[PDB]
Amino acid sequence: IRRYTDQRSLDRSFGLVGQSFCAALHQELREYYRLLSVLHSQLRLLVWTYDPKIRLKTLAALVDHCQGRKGGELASAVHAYTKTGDPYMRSLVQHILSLVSHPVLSFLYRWIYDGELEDTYHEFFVASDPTVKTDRLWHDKYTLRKSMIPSFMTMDQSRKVL
Amino acid sequence: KSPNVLLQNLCCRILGRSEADVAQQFQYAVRVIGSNFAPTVERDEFLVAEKIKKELIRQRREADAALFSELHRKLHSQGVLKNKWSILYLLLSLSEDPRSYATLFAQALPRDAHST
C-alpha cells in the first residue's frame, strides 16, 4: 500500500478516478503511520498488532485487485467488497468507495446537464462519433461502452442518462 | 449585573421611552459596544488628569483647574476605585462648556509596537 499510493501519484496518466482512489489510499495509509509514529518513541509489538493484522490484510487485497484499474473497472473493484454482510468491512471500505464514486458522478453532472463530455480519458461510457450532426445526433452518435458501466448503477441508471 | 442587561438599563435611563418603543437604536448600540470591551491602549490616569487640565484651560477657568487637583487627590485618598482611568476618560469624553487642535497633542500609546 505504501508503494502503490506513491507510484500512481507521480503518474498523471492514471486518470480522474485513479487520482481519487490514491487520495483515499493516502488517508488509509495515514493510520498505520500513526502507529509507527507512536511505536518508535516507546522503544511488546504482539498485542498491539493483532487488530492491525486484520485491517492491513484487507487493504492489501484492495490494492491487489485495483492494480492498473480505473474508470468503470474501479467502480467494480472497490464496490466488489462493499457487498459483504459485515458492517465493519463496509465502514472500512467506505471513505474509499465514496472517493472513487465521486468522479463517476462528476462526469454525470456534465452529461445530465450541459457541460464537457468525458471520453478524452475513457472512464465514462459514452463513445461519441465526430462529424455526424445533421439528424443522427438524436439517433446514432453515442455507443454504450460496456466496460465502463458502473456496477453500483443498474442499466436503467447507467442509461436514460444518455 | 451581567453586562448585556445593563445595556438595556442604559437605553431605558437616557430615553424617556421603553425598549418596546424603538429597537433600531439598541441594535446599533450592540454594533458599537461589542468587540470594544478591553482597553487596547495604555490606561494612565495621570495623562487623563492632565487632559482635564488642558480642557479647563481651554474653557478659561484656572480656579476650576486648581480645584481639580484637590478632587484628584481625593481619589488617591480613598483608593477603592479600580480603573480610575476609565471613569474620568468617560466624563471627559462628554465634556461640555457651560460658558481646534486636539489630536495634535498628547494621546495614549497605540500598542502597534507591542503584541495586542
Add this chain to the structure above:
Amino acid sequence: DDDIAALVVDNGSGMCKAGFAGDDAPRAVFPSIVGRPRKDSYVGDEAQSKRGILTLKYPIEHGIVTNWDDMEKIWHHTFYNELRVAPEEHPVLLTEAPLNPKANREKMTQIMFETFNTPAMYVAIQAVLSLYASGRTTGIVMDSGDGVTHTVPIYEGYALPHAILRLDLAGRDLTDYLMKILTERGYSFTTTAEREIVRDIKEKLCYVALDFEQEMATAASSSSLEKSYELPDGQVITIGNERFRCPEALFQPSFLGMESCGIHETTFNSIMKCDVDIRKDLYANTVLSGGTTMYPGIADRMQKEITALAPSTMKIKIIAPPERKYSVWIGGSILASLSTFQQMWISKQEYDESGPSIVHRKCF
C-alpha cells in the same frame, strides 16, 4: 418492579376495562353489562349476547352510580373471573366521573375494604386522569362523557369546586337524537338492534361540519356529503345530511330543545368564575376528552369556536390528541405504574387512623 404489582380498573358505561399498570391498551376487556332476569352472576360474551331476555343496565351511565348491586357485581366478576387475581397481591386504583359525591367515595372505600378486603386503595376522578394523559396538570378540561358533562377548571393539580360547572349532556342523548329525528321524519326506528347499528355508524362513518352556516349552505345548494355505507349485516342506512347535524345541536340547544346551556356560554362562564390573575394561564390549555369522541371532525369546530371566543388579551392553546376515547384509562395506567406516586396512594394504616372519607381529601 420486584415489588408487589399495581392494578388499574376503569369501570365505564360502554365496556369495562381492566388492566395492569404500564400497559399499552387495557390488558383485558369486559362488557359493563350485569345480566339479571328481566345471567344473574355472569358477565361476558353470554351476558351481552343474551341481553334480549336479560336486563340491560350499566352502573355509571349518568355520572353517578345508578345501581349499587350492579357496581359491586361488575367489579367482583371482572376482578375474579377475567383477571383471575386475588386482592392481597394487587392494590387497585378506582375511577369516578366528575362531581361524584364524597359520601359515595366513603361508601365505595368502605365496601371495598370489607366485602373485598383490599390491602390498599385509591379512588381518582375522571378529568384529571384525562389531563394527565394529555401531558399537563393545570388547565381547563371540557369533558362530556357517556352520562355527564363538566367544564372542569383545574389549577395547582386539583379541581376548583366553585368553578366546576355541571352540564347535562351525554353521547346517549346524541344517539337518542338520532332516534328522534328518524322517528319524526317517518322512518321506523324504536328498536335496540337498529340503535346498535346507528351507534356503530356513529363511531365509524360520522363526519361533522366546520360551521353551522357553511355546511347548511352547501347542503342547501344541492346536497352531497353522503359517504355510502352498505353493511354486511344486511341493512342499508346512510344519509350524509343528517349526521353532521346530529352533534351540532350542542352549539344551539334549541335545535333539539335541550334544557342544558350552550357550549360557548358555558366555557365563557367557566373562565368567568375562575380567578382573574390565573385566568389567562388556565385558558391556555384546552383539552379533548370523553364520549364526544364520535369523530374528531368536531375537534376542528371546537377549536374554531374557542378561537372565536378568545380575545387578544388571552391566550389559547388547544391540545388535540386523537387519544380522547381511552383517555380515562391511559391516565390511571400512567399514574399507578410510578413508585413516587405511592406517596399519594393511601394505605390500610392511614385509612384506619384517619377514617374512610379521607380518600376524597388526599387525592390530588
Add this chain to the structure above:
Amino acid sequence: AAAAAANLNAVRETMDVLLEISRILNTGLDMETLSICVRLCEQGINPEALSSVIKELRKATEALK
C-alpha cells in the same frame, strides 16, 4: 456587616468626588444613569465606544420629541 459598610462609606465618598467632576463637565447623566456607567467601568469598558452611543441617544431623546 459593619466593615462592609465602612468600605461602602469610603466608596460613597469616591462617588461624590466623581459626582463633582461629573457636574463641572456638565454631563447630561444624572446620579442614576451615571451609576449604570460606573458598573460598566468596573467590568472594563472603552469609553470612546460608550461615548459614541451616548452622544447619539441624547440626540435621539430629542429627535422623536
Add this chain to the structure above:
Amino acid sequence: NLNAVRETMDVLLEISRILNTGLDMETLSICVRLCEQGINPEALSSVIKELRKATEALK
C-alpha cells in the same frame, strides 16, 4: 399559509445552527408548531431539556 411558514421555518434552521442549539429538524418542527399554538416558551425551554434527559436515563 403553508408556503409562508415553510419559508420562515427554513430561515429558522440557520439561526438555530449558529446559536448552537440542541435542536435537529424534528424537534425544531415539533417545537415551532408548539410555539405557534401559543404558551409560555420559557417553560418549554425546560421541558425539552427534561425530555431528552429522561430518555437518556433509560440508555
Add this chain to the structure above:
Amino acid sequence: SITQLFDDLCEALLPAANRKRAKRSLKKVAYNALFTNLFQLPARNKILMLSFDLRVGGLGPKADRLEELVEELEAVGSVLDLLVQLAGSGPPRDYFLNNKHVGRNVPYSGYDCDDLSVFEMDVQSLISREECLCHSMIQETLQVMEAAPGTGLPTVGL
C-alpha cells in the same frame, strides 16, 4: 399537528434495530417529564443582548448575520424566545485569513502575531483531533485486550 410531531419525536428516541410496546413506555416517560415543570421585553431584543455577547469573544460576521436576519423576520417571536434559552444546549485555510497578496485592497497592516497566532491555531485545531486519535487507538485497544479471563469481552458471556 403537534400530536403527530410528538409521535415522530418519540419514534426517533426509540432505537430501531417486538418494539411496538416500548414506544408507548417512552410516551409514558415523555408525558411524565412534560408535566413536571408545568406543575410548578420584546423578542428581538433577546437576540440583540446575545449578539453583543457574541461580539465580545471575537467572530464579528456571525453577529452581523444574526442581527440582520431577525430584522427581516420582524418585517414567530415565540420561537426566538424558545431559541435564546436553548443556545447553550448544543454540541459541547481557504484563501482568506491573512491574504495580503491578491485583492484590490491596500496592503497596509502592522505586526502583532495575534492574527497569525490564531492562524497557527486554525491548523492546530485540525492537528489536535489528528493527534488525539494516535493516543486514543492504542489506549482503547489496550483497555480491551487486557482483562480477566471469561469476562474479557461479553460474547463469551453467552
Add this chain to the structure above:
Amino acid sequence: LVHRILPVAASYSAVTRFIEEKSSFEYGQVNHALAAAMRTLVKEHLILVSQLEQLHRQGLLSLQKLWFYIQPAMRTMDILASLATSVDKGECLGGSTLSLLHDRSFSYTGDSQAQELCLYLTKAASAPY
C-alpha cells in the same frame, strides 16, 4: 522515508522562484496575478513547517509525523509546480496563461482537490483582464 517526502519540497523550491520571477513587468499582466495567488498556499506550507519545528523544541515531533502531515500539500503544491514549469517552458501570457487555468480546472474535476485550487487561481489571476 526522506526520499518519499522530497516531492513536496521539490514543488516548493521551484515555485517561489516562479513567484519572484513572474512578478516583473516583462511577464504579461495576467501572468503576474497568477503568481500572486500562488502565495496563499505557500503561507500555509511555511506555517505548518514552523509549527512542527516549535513542537520539536519540547520534544513532540518526529519524522513519521511530518510524513503523514504533508499528504494534502504534496498534491496541491505539485499542481502549482506543473503550472510554473509549463508557463516557463512556453511563452504563456495573457489569455494563453488564462487558457491553461480554464483547461486545468477541467482536466481534473472529479478530484475536488485539483479543481478547487484552479477554481480559485482562475478568479484571482484574471482581475486585470
